[PDB]
Design an enzyme around this catalytic site. Structure first.
Site, PDB file in Angstrom:
ATOM      1  N   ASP A 245      46.148  49.922  38.427  1.00 48.23           N
ATOM      2  CA  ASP A 245      47.178  49.221  39.492  1.00 48.23           C
ATOM      3  C   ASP A 245      46.502  48.780  40.852  1.00 48.23           C
ATOM      4  O   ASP A 245      47.188  47.262  41.137  1.00 48.23           O
ATOM      5  CB  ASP A 245      47.709  50.650  39.882  1.00 48.23           C
ATOM      6  CG  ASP A 245      49.110  50.974  39.214  1.00 48.23           C
ATOM      7  OD1 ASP A 245      49.451  49.952  37.927  1.00 48.23           O
ATOM      8  OD2 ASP A 245      49.085  51.674  39.122  1.00 48.23           O
TER       9      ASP A 245
ATOM     10  N   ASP B 116      53.587  57.230  38.866  1.00 45.13           N
ATOM     11  CA  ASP B 116      53.328  55.382  38.521  1.00 45.13           C
ATOM     12  C   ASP B 116      54.729  55.585  37.740  1.00 45.13           C
ATOM     13  O   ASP B 116      55.496  56.769  36.797  1.00 45.13           O
ATOM     14  CB  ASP B 116      52.199  55.140  37.279  1.00 45.13           C
ATOM     15  CG  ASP B 116      52.673  53.799  37.003  1.00 45.13           C
ATOM     16  OD1 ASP B 116      53.377  53.158  36.728  1.00 45.13           O
ATOM     17  OD2 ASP B 116      51.238  53.492  37.502  1.00 45.13           O
TER      18      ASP B 116
ATOM     19  N   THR C 207      57.256  48.429  39.019  1.00 41.10           N
ATOM     20  CA  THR C 207      57.707  49.527  38.419  1.00 41.10           C
ATOM     21  C   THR C 207      59.001  49.695  39.204  1.00 41.10           C
ATOM     22  O   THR C 207      60.154  50.541  38.410  1.00 41.10           O
ATOM     23  CB  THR C 207      57.325  49.794  37.146  1.00 41.10           C
ATOM     24  OG1 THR C 207      56.356  51.174  37.792  1.00 41.10           O
ATOM     25  CG2 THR C 207      56.058  49.207  36.519  1.00 41.10           C
ATOM     26  N   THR C 208      58.484  50.700  39.989  1.00 40.75           N
ATOM     27  CA  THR C 208      58.996  51.980  40.708  1.00 40.75           C
ATOM     28  C   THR C 208      60.427  51.160  41.671  1.00 40.75           C
ATOM     29  O   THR C 208      61.430  50.779  41.619  1.00 40.75           O
ATOM     30  CB  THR C 208      58.727  52.732  41.481  1.00 40.75           C
ATOM     31  OG1 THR C 208      58.062  53.716  40.431  1.00 40.75           O
ATOM     32  CG2 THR C 208      59.677  53.642  42.333  1.00 40.75           C
TER      33      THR C 208
HETATM   34  N1  LIG Z   1      50.639  52.987  54.420  1.00 45.91           N
HETATM   35  C1  LIG Z   1      52.292  52.619  54.007  1.00 45.91           C
HETATM   36  N2  LIG Z   1      53.373  52.160  55.459  1.00 45.91           N
HETATM   37  C2  LIG Z   1      54.430  52.056  55.250  1.00 45.91           C
HETATM   38  N3  LIG Z   1      54.315  51.118  53.480  1.00 45.91           N
HETATM   39  C3  LIG Z   1      53.729  51.560  52.931  1.00 45.91           C
HETATM   40  C4  LIG Z   1      52.680  52.193  52.838  1.00 45.91           C
HETATM   41  N4  LIG Z   1      52.128  52.104  51.422  1.00 45.91           N
HETATM   42  C5  LIG Z   1      52.770  50.921  50.476  1.00 45.91           C
HETATM   43  N5  LIG Z   1      54.288  51.674  52.203  1.00 45.91           N
HETATM   44  C6  LIG Z   1      55.335  50.601  50.560  1.00 45.91           C
HETATM   45  O1  LIG Z   1      56.097  51.676  49.607  1.00 45.91           O
HETATM   46  C7  LIG Z   1      56.171  51.387  48.494  1.00 45.91           C
HETATM   47  C8  LIG Z   1      55.142  51.420  47.470  1.00 45.91           C
HETATM   48  O2  LIG Z   1      55.688  51.700  46.103  1.00 45.91           O
HETATM   49  P1  LIG Z   1      55.035  51.861  44.768  1.00 45.91           P
HETATM   50  O3  LIG Z   1      55.169  53.235  44.773  1.00 45.91           O
HETATM   51  O4  LIG Z   1      53.706  51.604  45.046  1.00 45.91           O
HETATM   52  O5  LIG Z   1      56.169  51.396  43.815  1.00 45.91           O
HETATM   53  P2  LIG Z   1      54.858  50.642  42.628  1.00 45.91           P
HETATM   54  O6  LIG Z   1      53.705  51.058  42.022  1.00 45.91           O
HETATM   55  O7  LIG Z   1      56.439  50.078  41.726  1.00 45.91           O
HETATM   56  O8  LIG Z   1      54.535  49.464  42.460  1.00 45.91           O
HETATM   57  C9  LIG Z   1      55.531  49.363  48.354  1.00 45.91           C
HETATM   58  O9  LIG Z   1      56.555  48.609  48.358  1.00 45.91           O
HETATM   59  C10 LIG Z   1      54.900  48.897  50.072  1.00 45.91           C
HETATM   60  O10 LIG Z   1      55.736  48.020  51.201  1.00 45.91           O
END
Ligand SMILES: Nc1ncnc2c1ncn2[C@@H]1O[C@H](COP(=O)(O)OP(=O)(O)O)[C@@H](O)[C@H]1O
Ligand SMILES: Nc1ncnc2c1ncn2[C@@H]1O[C@H](COP(=O)(O)OP(=O)(O)O)[C@@H](O)[C@H]1O
Ligand SMILES: Nc1ncnc2c1ncn2[C@@H]1O[C@H](COP(=O)(O)OP(=O)(O)O)[C@@H](O)[C@H]1O
Ligand SMILES: [Mg+2]
Ligand SMILES: [Mg+2]
Ligand SMILES: [Mg+2]
Lengths: 48, 538, 525, 527
Positions: free
Chosen positions: C392, C58, C91-92
């Site tokens: 989350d 996270d 946040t990331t």
């Molecule tokens: N199965 C998936 N395939 C492709 N892209 C994904 C998938 N799951 C999430 N993503 C993308 O990756 C990002 C994940 O970010 P994340 O690690 O959740 O950062 P934060 O926790 O700050 O939101 C999202 O913006 C989403 O668009």
């Protein structure tokens, strides 16, 4: 240097078990003799 | 050109005492090395031929034992990956009670082979998925390896035979005597209702006579003395009180208001008369033994002595509750005489001296009761503590058998069969996960290898013979420790068996710990603080 | 330095030094947090000073647990903290976008351009991007399937695939359980209770409550089938008089009378409870459970247990409302007028013992408006990670329900928005087109980081996705398994619209404010 | 953490991206410091040493040596610039700027996941193409005084004030043309650079002769000789001890007097040989003899020479032997065994000038001197040092221009043309090395950027104006430092040395490629 490290790693593998280092050393020397023989076998001449 | 500055960015922004490890070589290999070192430290205590270890904690307290969980608890482990491994071992101890050393050995082997696989070229995710697939396959296979079942638990002989193997790894020299003792203690407990409580088995440690003199008592033993003059009762009618053996007082504030000479001259006499009346009312119900959880007043003690009432004062409320369970009485909150349902009955209560210590014994005669006590003798406190740990392991094994009655062969037979069948399954699976599956199968070899190393024979010969025999079709053949040369024998006839739940939970927890350690890619360690323990731990 | 003349022991970074320091700190944070993005991210280990272990990826947790002592890092940490507080996600991406915005701005500032023009371009691009985000959002009926898709998109990036699969069902079912039609969702009505005795996949949803305490009397029943729940906030233990009462007696008999008569006040309320229990259930078939926010002395516990009543003391304050909504009774602060209509109902109440700690389960409610998720894991850090993941997921599902719109994920909206910004750039007057281009390039960071985490190369994947979007016009993201362009809507990779809007607003504001900083001062000593 | 730190606990290691980031940061810091040096519109920097000596300079190498830097990459770049100064004498600031911009442009693509090897391949391809274009664009020309004046101006204007540069241009061009033999290499050792500290900075000039920092020791010796015969010798005219520990033995005072008188016979023989030569050459008092001796002369020999009206100097510099033989035309003598009037130099005027405590001797009005001197004058020591550095740079520029007849238009025109040629050639490069070629072109574009920035104009607007003008017209247009408009450097007279540009390209490309391929910095030599 890389070869020496790799051989010492694969020797440590046996040293973890109950094999005496002398057996490993004898095996290494026999292997070295065969390595030299194979290298001399697969070589090719050169016209200087 | 004489110094290397810190790289701009995170390297400079790090705190003075913090440490950052990132990447394979910096994090994963270091964690694997630490876990392997921990497994090496705990390896030599595995099996019946395991060697005791003297561990001295920071409080100069001796711990001579071959119990992996105790050794790890008394060790000041500092590497966080080793901390995860220790937590997995402790979770295995909590859930089952045995198999902690198995967890350590399996996790160490898994992480060593994971390091090998990472070196040869596989990615961490592929190794993790292969390990998980192999763990699922092993869990699917394990029920098919069950050889026999408990098929009864109210018996003594076969329960002792079942419990022998659990307490054969520890106290290898004399396990039949301990098996009989623990079997008797557990059979006294475990009534018609299927629920079995581990806490209903009490261990009393009295020093002096050697462990061969230990006995099992259908009752409770307290290292105390009678408050009054009576020291023996033959038809006890114990009445248990949670209140002090004294006239109760107002909870707000007591103030004896005297306004005349007659009140001053009569107050103490009336108080004494009230105390005498209360004690005589208690005695008139037939209660010849009184147990209290608080202090004992002088006048109350005198009037109890007058009516020949045996007094025992128990400081611990846990002891009071356990005595109530044993005798069948209810801890009254006031000093009122007990009704017939609230009065407990014990067939004998008396003061006795065992060795040096004076004890008070609440002894039954029927082969039953809510709580049973094992009195442990010995020549050393440490030896009695080790015997107590063995008794705890046996009781936990009995509880597991009550939960699940299935058993698997021990001495590496189950591990070797699992390794063989997992290798056979992985030889058919295409893709890169076959390497991880085969390494997971090979990791099972560390159990028979450790057994052979501790026994003092050649591990490779034993493992090769085990593979040959299992290929022949014998699934119940394991290491024979009663030989000076590498030899194997059928473990079903030998009666060396392990609980199915123990193997299942140990495999699951070891695999989970290994994959959790493998999942870590970056480590950010704060500066080690000098605080006097976290406030959570008090 | 002018400041150093007044305060000799003062640290000052002025002019280009301030920009260099701020951009270096932002780039360091971005470099650390790159590996978090996406489900293919790397798991991080955080060891505290006391030796505690936390496993997480996270962004907010990592930022709070990094050993960093930089001002700009503190600013970005506060921005991410607000992001987590309001929306609970992104946040990331917040940190990544801030860092990339600063880097792209520096790319033009280092060539003699003034930051004010870059900020003007940033504001214009932000306005256009918000308009495009409004245009591209997908309004939908938030059925169970869409909520499951959103929960998966969050949890898979937070935890293991199978654990995420379980947590999706748990979170979606809990949210659908506590949700009243046309009413804001109260997340306080979901109790997150954690147990430490089984595997992580054993986390489930209980249509009731789990209390971390049990009955204090051994003789109380350990299992009640049909229970009447009495949620009360009445002290049942001895209480001192507020006016320093004190007792005065002249004999032992008077002392006995005063002792017996000093418990009458509490005994009256205990007798009221017992009388209500007798009236409500005249047989032994039904059961009676009393949950009290205040303590109960042993005498009252014994008196209640004599009547076959299970009593729990020192309950949490929120548990009053939780039991009122789940069981259906009513919290009582007094017993002046208590009637069978004030009692809740539970179809099963039993106690669970785990080591020293004991737990009480209250299940089989009629229509529980408040439920609980029971986190089970073999380690403390596993429990903490699952707690963060379920937080989350709950935030994501609540956000998705709050507004019927949802945005395609996998960075597709970033790519389309950058393309729209590039198209709109000629309309911007002046040199703010450079700021617009920098904003578009910064917005393009998410697919780049996703490609890195999936193992592919940035440029090839990005140009493939951009070409596919230009040729087809669809919302194509990053396929983390193949690297090819892929329609995120079809596969069910959804992002919260509110999360994207907050990301744009906060990132643009903080980048604009940081770019305009020309001096860093520490002269308060 | 690392393997080296495990083996050596107190070892500092920067690995993987850390090493690249450290190197790029150091290069960018050096470039940021040295941006303001480029161009005649640059800014003076005042450097104070530990002892408190003040130095005013704008030279890139001089600034680098006096920078208080202890960084490895900075040391590497400083060594590269030192070699650049040693061989060509110009382009140190441009060297540092190009290296820094190359590293920055390479990092621009490296931070996007690209491997440095591809960037280095693009760099080498672009360097080959740029060298071909530089060969194409150079201006071969027979170089008269005007072109040399233009080159010396293009150097000195960027090194010193405009008026001082204008004076130094004539000085350096005249000196170089004076010592220049036909189709022969130029020996810069034959131009003495002498400093005095009594006049203004614009009083520096060229003397068609030689100036010596020492004068005659005997006071009665003549101060100004109108017509002079020059005798350049390397013979010790002072007292010489016997090699084999002679010692004197006598028995009376008269014997001691005889031995004292006799012990000077050896030196008196040489002195009387000189006197006889002087009497034979000039029997009147019209002419005079100047005797420059590399070795000392004891007071007795000085008095004996002064009795004959001969001026003579002792303890001269070794190079002054060759300088006098080339200027006056005599023969340097290591012994007077057989000396003839044919070995005597000539000088149309010899006079002694006194400045405070020290003495100076002027040898002027030679027949056709092949070795002249440059006389630096100024009111301060730092002024003299700055003028000395400027004169060295101008001498190197003129000598380099004379060496190869070609010359390159300046004002960054060649950089812009090379960048456009590289951009056009980029599609011909196969693979992803086109990114490296683009980075190389952008790095080459730094010179007009820095010139416009130092002149105070807008960097990007000026750059796009220059690029558009060059693309539309096809000419070699530079940056005008007064207006910012495109200007034809060839017509205006802003010329750069072709060898300097070639060395810049080669050295910058090589060092950038070597730095980009470094993935670990180690310091584990302790213990
Ligand atoms: N199965 C998936 N395939 C492709 N892209 C994904 C998938 N799951 C999430 N993503 C993308 O990756 C990002 C994940 O970010 P994340 O690690 O959740 O950062 P934060 O926790 O700050 O939101 C999202 O913006 C989403 O668009
Ligand atoms: N008599 C025996 N012969 C051979 N192996 C045995 C015997 N008794 C026990 N074992 C083996 O020893 C192992 C138990 O090791 P132990 O020291 O109890 O570690 P843990 O407490 O972690 O289980 C079991 O796997 C069992 O197979
Ligand atoms: N009068 C001028 N007008 C325009 N450009 C000039 C003028 N004089 C010099 N330049 C350019 O400025 C640059 C000066 O660089 P300089 O400061 O000499 O660096 P270095 O000392 O390292 O050679 C030259 O490349 C030249 O092309
Ligand atoms: Mg065991
Ligand atoms: Mg997220
Ligand atoms: Mg120059």
């Amino acid at each position: 240097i890389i070869l020496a490290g790799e051989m010492l790693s694969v020797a440590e593998h046996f040293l973890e078990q109950q094999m005496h280092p002398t057996v490993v050393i004898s095996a290494y020397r026999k292997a070295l003799d065969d390595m030299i023989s194979t290298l001399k076998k697969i070589s090719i001449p050169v016209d200087i | 050109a004489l110094h290397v500055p810190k790289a701009p960015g995170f390297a400079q922004m790090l705190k003075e005492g913090a440490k950052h490890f990132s990447g394979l070589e910096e994090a994963v290999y270091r964690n694997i090395q630490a876990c392997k070192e921990l497994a090496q430290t705990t390896r030599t205590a595995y099996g019946p031929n395991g060697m005791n270890k003297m561990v001295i904690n920071h409080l100069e307290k001796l711990f001579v034992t071959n119990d992996a969980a105790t050794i790890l608890r008394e060790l000041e482990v500092q590497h966080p990956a080793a901390k995860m491994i220790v937590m997995a071992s402790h979770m295995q101890e909590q859930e089952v009670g045995d198999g902690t050393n198995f967890v350590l050995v399996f996790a160490g082997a898994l992480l060593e082979l994971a390091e090998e696989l990472l070196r040869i070229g596989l990615s961490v995710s592929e190794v993790i998925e292969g390990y998980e697939i192999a763990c699922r396959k092993a869990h699917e296979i394990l029920p098919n390896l069950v050889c026999c079942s408990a098929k009864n638990l109210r018996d003594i002989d076969e329960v002792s035979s079942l419990l022998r193997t659990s307490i054969m790894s520890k106290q290898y020299g004399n396990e039949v005597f301990l098996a009989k003792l623990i079997a008797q203690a557990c059979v006294s407990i475990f009534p018609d209702s299927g629920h079995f409580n581990v806490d209903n088995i009490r261990v009393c440690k009295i020093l002096g006579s050697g462990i061969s003199s230990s006995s099992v008592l259908h009752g409770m033993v307290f290292k105390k003395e009678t408050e009054g003059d009576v020291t023996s009762v033959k038809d006890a009618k114990i009445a248990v009180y949670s209140c002090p053996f004294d006239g109760m007082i107002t909870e707000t504030k007591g103030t004896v208001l005297i306004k005349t000479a007659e009140e001053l001259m009569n107050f103490s006499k009336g108080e004494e008369n009230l105390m005498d009346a209360q004690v005589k009312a208690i005695a008139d119900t037939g209660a010849n033994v009184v147990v209290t959880g608080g202090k004992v007043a002088d006048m109350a003690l005198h009037y109890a002595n007058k009516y020949n009432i045996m007094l025992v004062r128990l400081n611990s409320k846990w002891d009071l509750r356990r005595l109530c369970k044993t005798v069948g009485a209810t801890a009254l909150p006031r000093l009122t005489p007990p009704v017939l349902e609230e009065m407990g009955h014990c067939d004998s209560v008396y003061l006795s001296e065992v060795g040096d210590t004076q004890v008070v014994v609440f002894k039954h005669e029927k082969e039953d009761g809510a709580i049973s006590t094992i009195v442990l003798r010995g020549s050393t406190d440490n030896l009695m503590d080790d015997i107590e740990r063995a008794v705890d392991d046996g009781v936990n094994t009995f509880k597991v058998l009550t939960r699940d009655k299935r058993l698997v062969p021990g001495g590496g037979a189950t591990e070797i069969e699992l390794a063989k069948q997992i290798t056979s399954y992985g030889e058919t699976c295409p893709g890169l996960e076959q390497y991880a599956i085969k390494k997971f199968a090979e990791a099972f070899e560390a159990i028979p290898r450790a057994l052979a190393e501790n026994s003092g024979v050649k591990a490779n010969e034993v493992i090769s013979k085990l593979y040959a025999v299992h290929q022949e079709g014998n699934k119940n053949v394991g290491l024979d420790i009663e030989a000076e040369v590498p030899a194997v024998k059928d473990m079903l006839e030998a009666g060396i068996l392990d609980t199915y739940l123990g193997k299942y939970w140990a495999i699951k927890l070891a695999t989970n710990a290994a994959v959790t350690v493998l999942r870590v890619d970056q480590i950010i360690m704060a500066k080690p603080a000098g605080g006097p323990k976290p406030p959570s731990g008090k | 330095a002018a400041v150093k003349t007044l305060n000799p022991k003062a640290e000052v970074a002025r002019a280009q030094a301030a920009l260099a320091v701020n951009i270096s700190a932002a780039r360091g944070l971005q470099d650390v947090l790159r590996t978090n993005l996406g489900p293919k991210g790397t798991m991080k280990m955080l060891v505290s000073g006391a030796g505690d272990i936390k496993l997480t990826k996270d962004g907010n947790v990592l930022l709070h647990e990094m050993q960093i002592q930089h001002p700009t890092a503190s600013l970005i940490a506060k921005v991410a903290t607000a992001q987590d507080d309001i929306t609970g996600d992104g946040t990331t991406s917040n940190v990544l976008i801030i860092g990339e915005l600063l880097k792209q701005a520096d790319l033009y500032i280092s060539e003699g351009l003034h930051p004010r023009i870059i900020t003007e371009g940033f504001e214009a691009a932000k306005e256009k991007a918000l308009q495009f985000l409004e245009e591209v959002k997908v309004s939908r009926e938030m059925d169970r399937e869409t909520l499951i898709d959103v929960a998966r998109t969050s949890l898979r990036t937070k935890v293991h695939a199978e654990l995420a699969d379980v947590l999706t069902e748990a979170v979606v079912d809990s949210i659908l359980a506590i949700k009243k039609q046309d009413e804001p969702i109260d997340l306080f009505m979901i109790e997150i209770m954690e147990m430490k005795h089984k595997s992580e996949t054993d986390t489930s949803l209980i249509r009731g409550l789990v209390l971390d305490h049990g009955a204090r009397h051994p003789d109380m029943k350990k299992r009640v089938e049909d229970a009447y729940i009495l949620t009360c906030n009445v002290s049942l233990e001895y209480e001192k008089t507020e006016v320093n009462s004190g007792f005065f007696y002249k004999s032992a008999e008077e002392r006995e009378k005063l002792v017996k008569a000093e418990r009458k006040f509490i005994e009256d309320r205990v007798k009221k409870i017992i009388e209500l229990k007798r009236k409500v259930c005249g047989d032994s078939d039904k059961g009676f459970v009393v949950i009290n926010q205040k303590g109960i002395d042993p005498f009252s516990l014994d008196a209640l247990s004599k009547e076959g009543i299970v009593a729990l003391r020192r309950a949490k304050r929120r548990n009053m409302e939780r039991l009122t909504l789940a069981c259906g009774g009513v919290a009582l602060n007094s017993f002046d007028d208590l009637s069978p209509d004030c009692l809740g109902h539970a179809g099963l109440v039993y106690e669970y013992t785990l080591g020293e700690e004991k737990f009480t389960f209250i299940e089989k409610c009629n229509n529980p408006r408040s439920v609980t998720l029971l986190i089970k894991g073999p380690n403390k850090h596993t429990l903490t990670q699952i707690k963060d993941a379920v937080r989350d997921g709950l935030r994501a599902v609540k956000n998705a329900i709050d507004d019927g719109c949802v945005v395609p994920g996998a960075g597709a909206v970033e790519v389309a928005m950058a393309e729209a910004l590039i198209k709109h750039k000629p309309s911007v007057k002046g040199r703010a087109q450079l700021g617009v281009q920098a904003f578009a390039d910064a917005l393009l960071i998410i697919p780049k980081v996703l490609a890195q985490n999936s193992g592919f190369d940035l440029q090839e994947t990005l140009v493939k996705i951009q070409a596919e979007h230009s040729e087809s016009g669809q919302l194509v993201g990053v396929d983390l398994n193949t690297g090819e362009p892929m329609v995120a809507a079809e596969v069910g990779v959804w992002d919260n619209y509110c999360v994207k809007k907050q990301l744009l607003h906060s990132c643009t504001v903080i980048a604009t404010n940081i770019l305009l900083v020309d001096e860093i001062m520490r002269a308060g000593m």
